[PDB]
Amino acid sequence: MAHKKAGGSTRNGRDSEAKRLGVKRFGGESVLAGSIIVRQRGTKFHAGANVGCGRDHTLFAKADGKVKFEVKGPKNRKFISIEAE
Amino acid sequence: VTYPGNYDQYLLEKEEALRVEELQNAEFDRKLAQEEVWIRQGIKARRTRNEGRVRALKAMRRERGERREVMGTAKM
Amino acid sequence: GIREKIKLVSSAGTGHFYTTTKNKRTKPEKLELKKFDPVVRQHVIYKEAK
Amino acid sequence: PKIKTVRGAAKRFKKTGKGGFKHKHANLRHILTKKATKRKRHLRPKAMVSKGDLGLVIACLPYA
Amino acid sequence: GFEGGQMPLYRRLPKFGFTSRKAAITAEIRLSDLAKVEGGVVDLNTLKAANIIGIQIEFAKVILAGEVTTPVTVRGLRVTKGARAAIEAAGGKIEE
RNA sequence: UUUUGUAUAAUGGGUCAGCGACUUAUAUUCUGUAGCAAGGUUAACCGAAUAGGGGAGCCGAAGGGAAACCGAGUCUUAACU
RNA sequence: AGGACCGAACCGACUAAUGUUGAAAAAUUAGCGGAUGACUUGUGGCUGGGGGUGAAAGGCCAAUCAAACCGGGAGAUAGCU
RNA sequence: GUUUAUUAAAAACACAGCACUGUGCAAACACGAAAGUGGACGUAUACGGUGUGACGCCUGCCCGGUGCCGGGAGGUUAAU
RNA sequence: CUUUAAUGUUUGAUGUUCUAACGUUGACCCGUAAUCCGGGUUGCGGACAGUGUCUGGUGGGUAGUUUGACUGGGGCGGUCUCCUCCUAAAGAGUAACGGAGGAGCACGAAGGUUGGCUAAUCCUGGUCGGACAUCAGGAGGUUAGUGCAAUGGCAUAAGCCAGCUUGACUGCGAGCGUGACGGCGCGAGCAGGUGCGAAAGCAGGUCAUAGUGAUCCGGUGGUUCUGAAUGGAAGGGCCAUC
Numbered sequence: 001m002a003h004k005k006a007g008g009s010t011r012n013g014r015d016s017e018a019k020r021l022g023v024k025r026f027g028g029e030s031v032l033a034g035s036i037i038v039r040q041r042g043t044k045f046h047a048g049a050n051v052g053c054g055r056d057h058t059l060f061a062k063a064d065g066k067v068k069f070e071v072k073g074p075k076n077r078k079f080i081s082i083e084a085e
Numbered sequence: 086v087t088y089p090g091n092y093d094q095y096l097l098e099k100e101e102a103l104r105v106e107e108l109q110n111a112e113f114d115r116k117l118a119q120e121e122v123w124i125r126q127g128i129k130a131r132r133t134r135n136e137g138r139v140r141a142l143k144a145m146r147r148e149r150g151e152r153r154e155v156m157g158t159a160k161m
Numbered sequence: 162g163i164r165e166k167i168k169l170v171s172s173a174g175t176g177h178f179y180t181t182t183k184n185k186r187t188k189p190e191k192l193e194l195k196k197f198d199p200v201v202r203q204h205v206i207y208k209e210a211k
Numbered sequence: 212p213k214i215k216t217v218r219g220a221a222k223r224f225k226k227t228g229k230g231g232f233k234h235k236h237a238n239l240r241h242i243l244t245k246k247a248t249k250r251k252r253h254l255r256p257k258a259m260v261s262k263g264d265l266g267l268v269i270a271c272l273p274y275a
Numbered sequence: 276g277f278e279g280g281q282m283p284l285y286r287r288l289p290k291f292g293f294t295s296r297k298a299a300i301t302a303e304i305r306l307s308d309l310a311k312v313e314g315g316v317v318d319l320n321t322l323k324a325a326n327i328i329g330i331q332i333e334f335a336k337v338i339l340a341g342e343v344t345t346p347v348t349v350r351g352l353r354v355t356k357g358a359r360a361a362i363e364a365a366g367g368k369i370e371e
Numbered sequence: 372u373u374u375u376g377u378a379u380a381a382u383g384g385g386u387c388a389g390c391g392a393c394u395u396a397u398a399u400u401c402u403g404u405a406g407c408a409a410g411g412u413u414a415a416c417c418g419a420a421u422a423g424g425g426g427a428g429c430c431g432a433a434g435g436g437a438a439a440c441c442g443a444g445u446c447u448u449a450a451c452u
Numbered sequence: 453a454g455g456a457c458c459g460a461a462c463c464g465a466c467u468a469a470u471g472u473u474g475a476a477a478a479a480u481u482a483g484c485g486g487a488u489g490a491c492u493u494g495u496g497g498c499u500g501g502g503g504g505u506g507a508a509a510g511g512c513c514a515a516u517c518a519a520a521c522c523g524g525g526a527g528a529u530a531g532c533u
Numbered sequence: 534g535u536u537u538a539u540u541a542a543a544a545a546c547a548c549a550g551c552a553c554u555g556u557g558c559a560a561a562c563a564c565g566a567a568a569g570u571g572g573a574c575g576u577a578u579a580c581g582g583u584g585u586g587a588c589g590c591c592u593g594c595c596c597g598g599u600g601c602c603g604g605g606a607g608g609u610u611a612a613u
Numbered sequence: 614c615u616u617u618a619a620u621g622u623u624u625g626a627u628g629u630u631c632u633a634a635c636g637u638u639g640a641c642c643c644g645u646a647a648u649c650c651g652g653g654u655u656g657c658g659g660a661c662a663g664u665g666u667c668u669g670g671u672g673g674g675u676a677g678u679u680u681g682a683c684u685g686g687g688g689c690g691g692u693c694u695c696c697u698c699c700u701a702a703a704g705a706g707u708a709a710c711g712g713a714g715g716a717g718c719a720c721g722a723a724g725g726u727u728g729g730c731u732a733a734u735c736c737u738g739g740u741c742g743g744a745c746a747u748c749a750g751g752a753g754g755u756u757a758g759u760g761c762a763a764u765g766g767c768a769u770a771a772g773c774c775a776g777c778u779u780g781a782c783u784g785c786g787a788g789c790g791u792g793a794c795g796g797c798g799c800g801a802g803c804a805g806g807u808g809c810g811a812a813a814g815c816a817g818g819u820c821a822u823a824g825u826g827a828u829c830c831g832g833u834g835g836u837u838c839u840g841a842a843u844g845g846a847a848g849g850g851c852c853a854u855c
């Protein structure tokens with residue numbers, strides 16, 4: 001009897017680890033110096049006042065304060081800035 | 086490798102080294118040729134296809150990254 | 162895996178070396194770069210080696 | 212009998228002043244041309260055994 | 276130290292250091308410990324005769340680890356520069 | 372009993388009586404309790420011997436460094452804000 | 453004359469039925485093959501366990517054999533019931 | 534003719550016959566740490582192994598592979 | 614001293630000759646009522662054979678064991694680590710033998726700075742010359758480009774070109790992110806030297822995310838840290854690296 005029929009394979013089915021990108025400190029959060037605000041892959045958020053940009057385009061605080069999200073600019077490109085507290 | 090005798094001796098002894106090495110080079114390809122008909126052969130009913138021969142074939146395919154005995158008689 | 166590892170032994174005598182890679186079949190010349198030598202704490206000329 | 216110590220762990224950990232254990236950072240034996248200098252100089256100092264691993268070391272070293 | 280099959284913590288990390296034979300024959304003396312030995316002379320023998328360091332210990336050091344009252348003449352030892360400031364105060368002579 | 376799940380047609384037991392399964396030596400850490408307290412305690416052995424001797428030793432009051440070494444500091448480093 | 457013929461003792465075991473907690477841990481009844489041969493049988497010997505013996509089936513070696521039985525290592529080990 | 538004592542008696546095993554191969558005798562070969570023993574109180578028209586299997590006609594091609602036999606220069610190669 | 618030729622004289626390799634080791638499962642004699650043994654007399658081999666220690670080859674004759682997991686039962690087929698997108702339900706994460714592709718590198722410039730610049734594509738005109746080459750001016754505005762996949766980005770360019778160059782530095786590092794851990798990552802700022810720029814400044818590799826391997830063991834360079842009586846040394850340790 002022909003009970004069990006042969007089956008094919010799948011050419012794909014491999015993937016990679018998740019990089020946990022995103023915003024780590026949302027607006028209105030009092031944050032210390034040198035800490036990480038948002039993890040990027042490009043630059044969806046640019047660096048405003050008192051913040052910097054790593055080689056990964058990671059945005060980090062420079063001096064302590066509050067987190068501010070703003071949309072200044074001719075091309076409506078979003079920034080992040082930190083106040084003075 | 087060194088050689089004894091006058092100059093014409095070397096030409097004779099070198100040609101034997103080239104001929105023999107040509108003779109053994111073809112024999113190695115002969116085994117590897119018939120060890121690739123076997124890798125893609127059907128298994129049969131409930132047999133396993135010994136991996137003491139699949140790994141050896143893996144070592145034969147890897148060994149083919151070796152020197153090409155004839156430099157190639159450049160054509161012009 | 163064409164590139165081969167090499168090291169740059171210091172000319173300042175103090176046994177020191179940076180290591181790097183080099184495409185040896187397209188770069189017959191030997192590197193000679195000026196880099197820090199922490200033993201003598203000066204910028205000297207580093208020449209290629211093994 | 213006395214509890215035999217695990218001689219392999221006694222060569223890798225050393226008890227500190229408040230009951231902790233110091234070890235030597237891994238990944239600094241060979242293949243050292245690839246790694247960035249920032250990475251190597253950070254594995255040079257000693258380290259502290261984490262809270263999760265703490266249970267497995269006090270078991271291996273009963274006399275120290 | 277069996278982690279289920281993966282390399283255990285004590286084989287995953289490298290060995291370091293070397294144990295010294297010299298550190299097994301030295302010791303430390305507390306400053307509160309100088310009032311126990313004898314009529315006022317401190318040496319290797321005057322301590323190890325008072326059950327203060329091991330009989331097979333040939334070096335010693337006196338650290339600022341208490342409070343000394345009586346003047347004592349440390350015959351030959353390696354008093355630190357903090358306990359020296361506490362032995363000369365009480366009236367103690369220090370030599371080699 | 373084992374299971375996601377058993378009246379289960381899944382396991383075991385015919386019934387009664389007797390027997391039958393988390394122990395013992397040494398070592399190490401934590402908790403309670405007792406004695407002493409910057410001290411605590413003896414081992415073998417001696418002993419008219421559960422007394423009394425015996426303090427050989429062990430833990431603790433100091434740590435840092437791979438180590439020499441320094442020491443309430445020490446290590447790294449040419450030096451650390 | 454003959455590893456000739458038919459055929460009881462003797463040796464074996466092809467078919468069928470009964471028996472399968474049997475009369476019997478392989479037998480009984482009815483037939484069945486060899487029956488002067490490479491036959492069959494009594495008594496006593498010899499070959500010992502990774503070994504023997506085997507006209508060869510992994511057969512037999514005390515109703516047990518792809519490595520006997522007895523004692524010991526021994527309370528082997530069991531991530532399994 | 535023999536065989537699975539106890540589910541298989543056969544086309545399986547043996548066989549007389551054939552071929553190959555080893556053995557010159559203190560034979561090859563086998564049982565034995567060894568002495569020794571069987572072969573054999575035998576001597577190549579004999580003994581051992583291997584395959585085939587009365588008798589009749591026959592038994593074709595391949596020495597590349599893996600084995601075995603002969604070689605004795607060269608290359609590689611141990612202890613000393 | 615560089616080639617060379619003999620007498621010897623040490624032994625080294627092949628050859629032959631002898632006897633005294635050794636062999637005799639040849640003959641004879643004795644212990645001996647004895648086809649074992651021992652001894653003696655002779656014959657034949659003879660420094661061979663054989664045995665002992667060391668050594669290369671062969672050696673399923675024998676022995677001990679190994680021979681992965683996932684899986685829509687097992688075998689066969691496929692896969693096993695790393696990167697990108699969807700599934701993934703607008704923070705993070707999230708499975709299937711779900712749907713699609715990639716990596717195991719490259720680069721002493723393709724890196725650092727200081728200057729300057731801006732594409733695709735179509736239309737029109739023009740020698741060969743064209744559907745598509747170079748050229749000119751128009752529309753258009755990144756539909757182009759990026760060393761190599763996909764995604765996110767990029768005009769202040771992160772794309773294109775040129776000059777000078779070695780920061781593709783040494784010691785550290787507040788504070789964070791992500792993991793059960795091992796680990797992985799981003800980092801202002803401090804000190805020592807350096808490059809470019811007139812300076813303000815920027816530079817601890819490359820637009821970012823793959824381009825990779827623990828520990829043990831050993832090799833190479835440096836360093837009085839240690840050095841089993843003492844002075845060395847060996848051998849260990851620390852730093853850089855294979």
Ligand SMILES: [Mg+2]
Binds near residue numbers: 239240
């Ligand atoms: Mg190292």
Ligand SMILES: [Mg+2]
Binds near residue numbers: 280
């Ligand atoms: Mg494993």
Ligand SMILES: [Mg+2]
Binds near residue numbers: 327
């Ligand atoms: Mg004492």
Ligand SMILES: [Mg+2]
């Ligand atoms: Mg069930």
Ligand SMILES: [Mg+2]
């Ligand atoms: Mg119910």
Ligand SMILES: [Mg+2]
């Ligand atoms: Mg019922």
Ligand SMILES: [Mg+2]
């Ligand atoms: Mg039931």
Ligand SMILES: [Mg+2]
């Ligand atoms: Mg069951």
Ligand SMILES: [Mg+2]
């Ligand atoms: Mg029952």
Ligand SMILES: [Mg+2]
Binds near residue numbers: 456
């Ligand atoms: Mg007859």
Ligand SMILES: [Mg+2]
């Ligand atoms: Mg008949």
Ligand SMILES: [Mg+2]
Binds near residue numbers: 459487
């Ligand atoms: Mg008859």
Ligand SMILES: [Mg+2]
């Ligand atoms: Mg009958």
Ligand SMILES: [Mg+2]
């Ligand atoms: Mg039987």
Ligand SMILES: [Mg+2]
């Ligand atoms: Mg067995």
Ligand SMILES: [Mg+2]
Binds near residue numbers: 525
């Ligand atoms: Mg046992």
